[PDB]
Amino acid sequence: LREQILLNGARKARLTELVKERMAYQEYQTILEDLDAQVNAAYLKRTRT
């Protein structure tokens, strides 16, 4: 048991290094998409009219 806990902690320790960087990408994407909708939705009106 003491042999396995350390391995699990090491594995979970590494994942926390990869999760944090992926969270930042989410915030950058969630604002980029909003701009994409406006620029995309701000041209359809030209076709409509």
């Binding site: 994409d36 620029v39 995309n40 041209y43 359809l44 076709t47």
Partner: protein, 130 residues
């Protein structure tokens, strides 16, 4: 002699003289009559069964095509709604005066860049699922 046959030379006249015309004609009449007799006695052709539709939906998930590796309802299947009425001005693409893309063109291309990114996001989702 790819563009031609091998016996392009008119001087070679062996095959014409190797069999007489009457003999060769006799064979033609013989093959014709038996073939006609075979056709008359031939069995009727079986009716064409229904065309073997490919039906790529074989996989045990409705709306998946293992042969094509493409789903029917993708991640953002509504991403085409923004460019399926798109049209372009003939013969344009560059401003004659300034040399830069005219304002409408640079806007039209920008709304195509988003669609390309949408396609790439789909592929990554498919890659993980495989």
């Amino acid at each position: 002699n790819f563009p031609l046959p091998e016996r392009c030379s008119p001087y070679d006249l062996e095959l014409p003289n190797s069999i007489s015309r009457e003999e060769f004609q006799a064979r033609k009449k013989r093959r014709i009559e038996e073939r006609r007799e075979a056709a008359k006695n031939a069995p009727p052709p079986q009716p064409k069964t229904k065309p073997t539709a490919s039906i790529p939906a074989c996989h045990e998930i409705q709306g998946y095509m293992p042969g094509r590796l493409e789903f029917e309802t993708e991640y953002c299947n509504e991403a085409e709604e923004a460019v399926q009425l798109m049209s372009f001005d003939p013969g344009d693409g560059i401003n004659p005066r300034t040399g830069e893309l005219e304002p409408e063109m640079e806007l039209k291309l920008t709304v195509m860049e988003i669609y390309n990114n949408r396609l790439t996001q789909r592929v990554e989702r498919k890659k993980v699922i495989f």
